[PDB]
Design a protein around this ligand. Structure first.
Ligand code: SF4
Ligand code: SF4
Ligand SMILES: [F-]
Ligand SMILES: [F-]
Ligand SMILES: [F-]
Ligand SMILES: [F-]
Ligand code: NA
Ligand code: NA
Ligand code: NA
Ligand code: NI
Ligand code: NI
Lengths: 708, 629
């Protein structure tokens, strides 16, 4: 049968029933008996919202059938279907009203029956605050008492209000669920027409909170659709009458999810036969997001857990550093190339290793499918992995791509932590964070040595090379806009990073193109655009609008910033810099120490000691925190003298930047042996010894201008 | 007495044309006065020098048969056939050039592959391997296999996947399954020779067989390959009508059809030398404007402004602001050569397929396409020095329009209303559902030309406005689409303005206008791709869906071929201009009745658009009842 005729037929059936019971009314009690619901100032709310007229006696109830007849034009056009759906609703209020005129107490517990106005007020304010995210009008019969309780307890757990009508009330009491207003589980009645008692919840909610007047029906329907979050779940075989009632929910704005095969209408009438995932489709169909995403991992998850410090004596497993090859990757993929919620651990898990803390390789492959996802968003999704994982109690994550470093603790394993939980966090958070641009997620955590090698140079390296290639072309002068990120104000409140093409974010994981993309996904996000205007000095990089926005975002703690200078008004540093640059006056230059290097530097300090002299969002002259790729930058210390100031690095920093740095040296008319002139820890580590090394090699910094 | 147009800018310039003393297409239609009723009925034949013969369109009276013995039905059906053969050939050579350009794509060449995903998907339809192969070896293998669809003498032809298998086996049993494109054009031309076919049914069946090589091959490959090389269209904003011409900019108007030239002119209009040159002659910049299909082709992909449609091409020159009129082939009124003698406009022909006397021939070198477009554009920019700004009259009338609605983009837009945990993504299911449910009563394609027999754009606008009022979503191509663009229907605001309740709801949910501009007239293949996808998704054939096509103001033989393949594919077609068929009653019964028993659709000839809208709605509801929706 056609869907319009299926609604019309039920609408006529609804009318026919109302004529029958209102005929019982006029015979037992005459046309002059009081008609009223308990504790309601709005008489018959559906009839009141439509026509602004109150119904008091039986003669008026009988006369209100003309309303249902006027709403029931049988023409296959969308508006006539909604009106016909309203007709079924009005006839439901009529039938229900007659129930209360033939019996003084027609409903007896466990069925609540009609809802009084004071309960509307008690229940309305948390609907405005969203403390109850939506209301779930579930009617019909589930194939199994277990499958019904499974669903109502799911809704109950989300905090939202669920209302039962039909056989499910008997299935829910069988399923051990407990009803009550404080339990947010209300049974209306066994008859189909008692759905009108949740419909009168939303309508009376408009008349009280929205302050709209009776008879402003189209303004009511706008309030019910936009404000009150309702959705109806129809289970079991669907009669023509209940399908008609479903049209009424469409009229108020409520999507109708069902398990019965039915002619679907997008965002309005849908079939979901997988009961386990029915709650998810319903919440989405009503655009309902729960305040806290569900996490299957047992260990605690919160933002406060980030930044926790795990020492060698408390760690269980360590991945990354200069010790192991560990990488993470996020790449866009086709819809058929990924299976949703597919978690795979290839290699030794944490249960296999029962010995002392050891080091495993770690390759985190994250395949994502999206309708509007594109290749320019992959670094944005990769960035959140650091913030996703560190939130988990007992695990620590730093680094960016293949230079990552992960530590898991002994507490989480004693609490039953598994590598399977890694994908469970990434799967749920990627959806919650990016619920508009992401369709499916597939996570594969690799501790296998072969597959880690068989997935680094094959999918991880080419995605990085193409990534790092798109920035190599750009120069700060070519662009007209810089970006400001404040994500790390969680522990450095006065700190703001200004990302440029030639000055990457000091974490290394945020680029100028990355910061441009984060703004496209999140306009209310951390990264914000800053136009290159009001330039006062190009050599050191001082911009008037940059000083305007830094003062605002830092809440007046910073007044002026120079981008390409570390002595005059330097940009602050947070606490996630991969390397540190420190001023050495003896060598007329600066030294650079990386996080992984643990011995002393000629400044008489270690990286942990230098890190205490730069971070915290404090304007520190002579010290800066910066990423690894910023070393070979043309604009790196351009005011002081560029890369020519470096005189001391660890050997690991040399070998990693040998290709990138030699080229920037020749670009500044420095002989290709410039990477070799820099001193390292296999030569000398004290200024007394290093100075004579710099006098032997003929370092270009020695014959430069004094830095200060 | 009768109005010449419903567009004000069109009327304003028409008054200037009278003042300047120049001829227009309206004036020449008037000079023709009462046109010969024989040729208007199709009962005149000139297929041999025994004639010209003319038989009476009224059966039983006058001369009955031609000298060779051909009846009125024989003469009409043969004349109808050669129209299809012509329109087929028009789209044929169009797609053949596009396939040849694809064969000559290179990594570093002027023509490249821009939509790798589409090429890989099209290659699967031609059984061309794609795994691990260079993307240009693939494109060449696809081009070769597509070119074989034009002249293969052995084996079967390759047809798109969205063509329902029910319809293929229907064609096979009816005997109209297509062969090679050029091979069918020759076949129709053969049987229409004197002393060959003399049976209306067999003659029409040949015409239907010919038209299939257009919609599902010539026009289809042309569109698919045009997307591969230039980019698949996506939703994009533009301005339409003659107000897009700027007085203080170099106005270069691209008229015609073949998109390679206009695609190269777009890229040539960004060459710093050519940008600096327009500034050196005193202008603000280069203002590219398109007309007709080459204007549609660049607007769908690059949002180039649409100057106007068919019967406006003369009026663009009358503004006195067109510095260059660069044309290729198809639907370039030869009057432009005489008209532009009265203005500084340089009227430049570029294709050896369409030389025009007294024009400026600048052959578009397809072996150096970008260099060649630059050479043509530079001539247009230099001609700006000869403009007389005192005689310039650019009407202050232009409307915003959204277009770029390819099948991929409509599917992409429909994904928004798909529940993440329920339905499938990247399908046409959302559209099928609103049709099955009845929220949308149906879908109607409104295509076609302009024709002086109809108030220009008036039948387009009334047909479209009436269909969207009855909750029938409307897709448009070609000059009808550009007529919707000018009027202001290609706007999301047009939903609450003109649409019925169901269409207005779908428009808000999908974030689309009630009228979807699906591109040029070879891009009608997108409509078949769409409808066929809905039929396949619902397990039915295309004759079973509530769909319809309308040609309210058609003129070209291309439209007759287009209308004929739309019907043979299974879609009812309404014509707003009577084709020359009234003389042969058997031909009339075939096109308007017996056609139903053959392919599940038939032609409708209705000149009142409001009546046509009734018929379309009623026929849709009729088909809906048969299907149970
Ligand atoms: S290092 Fe800078 S760009 Fe990166 S998250 Fe911290 S404040 Fe933002
Ligand atoms: S084909 Fe026959 S009717 Fe036609 S012009 Fe020739 S002789 Fe005459
Ligand atoms: F009851
Ligand atoms: F961090
Ligand atoms: F002029
Ligand atoms: F040719
Ligand atoms: Na295709
Ligand atoms: Na001229
Ligand atoms: Na018939
Ligand atoms: Ni930071
Ligand atoms: Ni930091």
């Amino acid at each position: 049968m056609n869907l319009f005729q299926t609604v019309f037929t039920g609408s006529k059936q609804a009318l026919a029933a109302a004529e029958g019971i209102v005929k019982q009314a006029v015979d037992e009690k005459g046309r002059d008996y009081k008609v009223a619901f308990p504790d309601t100032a709005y008489s018959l709310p559906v009839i009141f919202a439509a026509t602004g007229k109150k119904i008091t006696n039986v003669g008026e109830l009988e006369g209100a059938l003309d309303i249902v007849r006027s709403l029931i034009v049988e023409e296959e056009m969308l508006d006539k279907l909604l009106n016909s759906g309203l007709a079924t609703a009005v006839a439901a209020e009529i039938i229900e009203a007659a129930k209360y005129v033939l019996s003084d107490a027609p409903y007896a517990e466990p069925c609540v029956g009609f809802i009084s106005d004071p309960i509307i007020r008690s229940l309305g304010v948390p609907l405005v605050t969203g403390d109850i995210p939506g209301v779930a009008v579930i009617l019909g019969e589930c194939p199994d008492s277990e499958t019904a309780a499974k669903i109502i307890k799911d809704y109950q757990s989300k905090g939202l209000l669920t209302c039962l009508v039909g056989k499910v009330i008997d299935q829910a009491i069988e399923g051990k669920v407990k009803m009550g207003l404080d339990l947010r589980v209300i049974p209306l009645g066994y008859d189909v027409t008692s759905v009108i008692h949740v419909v009168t919840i939303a309508i009376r909610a408009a008349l009280i909170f929205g302050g709209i007047k009776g008879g402003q029906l189209n303004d009511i329907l706008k309030y019910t659709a936009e404000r009150v979050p309702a959705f109806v779940n129809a289970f079991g075989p669907l009669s023509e009458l209940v399908v008609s009632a479903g049209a009424g929910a469409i009229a108020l704005g409520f999507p109708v999810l069902t398990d019965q095969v039915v002619p679907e209408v997008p965002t309005l009438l849908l079939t979901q036969k997988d009961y386990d995932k029915m709650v998810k489709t319903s919440l989405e169909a009503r655009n309902i997001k729960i305040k806290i995403t569900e996490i299957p991992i047992p260990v605690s998850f919160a933002a406060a857990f980030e930044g926790e410090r795990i020492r060698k004596n408390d760690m269980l497993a360590e991945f990354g550093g200069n010790k192991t090859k560990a990488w993470e990757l996020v790449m866009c993929a086709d819809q058929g190339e990924v299976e949703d919620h597919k978690i795979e651990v290839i290699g030794p898990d944490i249960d296999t290793i029962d010995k002392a803390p050891g080091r495993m390789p770690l390759g985190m492959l994250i395949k994502v499918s999206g309708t509007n996802m594109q290749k320019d968003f992959e670094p944005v999704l990769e960035r959140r992995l650091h913030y996703f994982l560190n939130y988990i109690e007992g695990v620590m994550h730093v680094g960016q791509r293949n230079l990552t470093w992960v530590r898991i603790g002994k507490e989480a394993f004693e609490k039953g932590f598994r590598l399977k939980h890694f994908g469970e966090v990434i799967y749920a958070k990627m959806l919650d964070e990016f619920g508009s641009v992401v369709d499916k997620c597939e996570v594969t955590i690799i501790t296998d040595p072969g597959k880690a090698e068989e997935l680094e140079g094959k999918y991880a390296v080419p995605r990085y090379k193409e990534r790092d290639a798109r920035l190599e072309s750009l120069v700060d002068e070519k662009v007209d806009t810089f970006y400001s990120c404040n994500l790390c104000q969680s522990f450095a409140p006065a700190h703001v990073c200004i990302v440029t093409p030639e000055r990457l974010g000091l974490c290394g994981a945020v680029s100028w193109l990355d910061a441009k993309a984060t703004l496209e996904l999140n306009p209310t996000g951390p990264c914000q655009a800053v136009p290159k205007e009001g330039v006062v000095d190009e050599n050191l990089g001082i911009w008037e609008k940059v000083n305007e926005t830094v003062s605002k975002i830092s809440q007046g703690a910073v007044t002026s910033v120079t981008l390409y200078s570390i002595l005059q008004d330097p940009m602050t540093s947070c606490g996630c810099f991969e390397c540190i640059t420190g001023i050495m006056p003896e060598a007329n230059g600066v030294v650079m120490v990386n996080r992984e290097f643990g011995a002393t530097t000629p400044l008489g300090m270690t990286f942990g000691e230098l890190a205490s002299m730069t971070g915290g969002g404090v304007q520190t002259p002579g010290f800066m925190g910066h990423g690894r790729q910023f070393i070979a930058s043309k604009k790196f210390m351009k005011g002081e003298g560029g890369l020519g100031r470096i005189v001391w690095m660890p050997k690991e920093l040399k070998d990693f930047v040998a290709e990138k740095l030699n080229k920037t040296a020749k670009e500044l008319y420095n002989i290709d042996n410039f990477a070799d002139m820099i001193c390292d820890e296999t030569i000398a580590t004290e200024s007394e010894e290093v100075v004579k090394f710099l006098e032997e090699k003929g370092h270009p910094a020695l014959k430069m201008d004094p830095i200060m | 007495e009768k109005a010449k147009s419903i567009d004000q800018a069109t009327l304003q310039l028409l008054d200037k044309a009278k003042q300047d003393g120049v001829e227009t297409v309206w004036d020449r239609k008037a000079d023709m006065k009462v046109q010969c009723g024989f040729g208007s009925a199709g009962v005149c034949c000139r297929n041999c020098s025994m004639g010209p013969c003319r038989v009476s369109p009224v059966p039983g009276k006058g001369v009955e048969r031609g000298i060779c013995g051909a009846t009125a039905d024989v003469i009409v059906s043969r004349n109808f056939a050669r129209m299809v053969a012509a329109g087929t050939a028009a789209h044929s050579d169009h797609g053949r050039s596009i396939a040849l350009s694809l064969y000559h794509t290179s990594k570093d060449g002027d023509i490249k592959v821009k939509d790798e995903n589409k090429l890989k998907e099209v290659a699967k339809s031609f059984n061309v391997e794609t795994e691990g192969r260079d993307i240009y070896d693939i494109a060449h293998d696809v081009a070769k296999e597509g070119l074989s669809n034009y002249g293969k003498q052995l084996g079967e032809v390759t047809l798109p996947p969205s063509l329902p298998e029910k319809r293929k086996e229907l064609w096979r049993k009816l005997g109209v399954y297509p062969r090679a494109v050029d091979r069918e054009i020759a076949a129709v031309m053969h049987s229409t020779h004197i002393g060959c076919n003399a049976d209306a049914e067999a003659m029409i069946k040949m015409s239907m067989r010919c038209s299939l090589t257009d919609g599902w091959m010539g026009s289809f490959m042309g569109t698919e390959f045009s997307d591969i090389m230039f980019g698949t269209p996506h939703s994009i904003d533009t301005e339409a009508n003659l107000g897009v011409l700027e007085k203080n900019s170099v106005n270069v108007v691209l008229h015609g059809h073949e998109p390679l030239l206009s695609e190269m002119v777009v890229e040539a209009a960004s060459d710093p030398e050519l940008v600096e040159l327009a500034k050196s002659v005193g202008a603000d910049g280069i203002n590219l404007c398109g007309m007709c299909c080459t204007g549609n082709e660049v607007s769908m992909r690059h949002g180039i402004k649409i100057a106007g449609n068919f019967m406006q091409q003369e009026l663009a020159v009358v503004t006195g602001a067109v510095d260059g009129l660069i044309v290729d082939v198809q639907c370039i009124m030869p009057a432009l050569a005489k008209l532009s003698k009265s203005y500084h406009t340089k009227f430049i022909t570029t294709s050896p397929k369409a030389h025009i006397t007294d024009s400026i021939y600048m052959e578009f070198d397809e072996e150096n396409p970008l260099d060649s477009a630059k050479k043509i554009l530079k001539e247009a920019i230099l001609n700006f020095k000869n403009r007389d700004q005192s005689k310039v009259m650019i009407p202050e009338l232009k409307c915003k329009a959204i277009l770029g609605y390819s099948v991929e983009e409509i599917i992409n837009k429909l994904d928004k209303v798909v529940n993440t945990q329920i339905g499938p993504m990247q399908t046409v299911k959302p559209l099928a559902d609103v049709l099955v449910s009845g929220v949308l009563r149906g879908a109607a394609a409104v295509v076609g030309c302009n024709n002086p027999k109809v108030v220009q754009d008036s039948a387009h606008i009334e047909t479209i406005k009436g269909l969207i009022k009855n909750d029938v979503i409307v897709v448009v191509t070609g000059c009808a689409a550009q007529a919707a663009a000018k009027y202001g229907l290609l706007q999301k605001e047009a939903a609450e303005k003109y649409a019925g309740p169901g269409l207005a709801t779908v428009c808000k949910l999908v974030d689309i206008p009630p009228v979807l501009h699906m591109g040029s007239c070879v891009d009608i293949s997108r409509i078949l791709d769409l409808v066929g996808r809905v039929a396949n998704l619902l397990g039915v054939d295309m004759s079973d869906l509530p769909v319809a096509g309308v040609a309210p103001e058609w003129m070209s033989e291309k439209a007759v071929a287009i209308g004929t393949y739309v019907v043979t594919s299974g879609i009812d077609t309404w014509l707003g201009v009577a084709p020359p068929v009234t003389g042969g009653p058997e031909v009339v019964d075939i096109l308007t009745n017996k056609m139903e028993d053959w392919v599940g659709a038939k032609f409708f000839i209705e000149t009142d658009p409001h009546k046509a809208v009734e018929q379309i709605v009623n026929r849709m509801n009729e088909k809906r009842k048969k299907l149970g929706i």
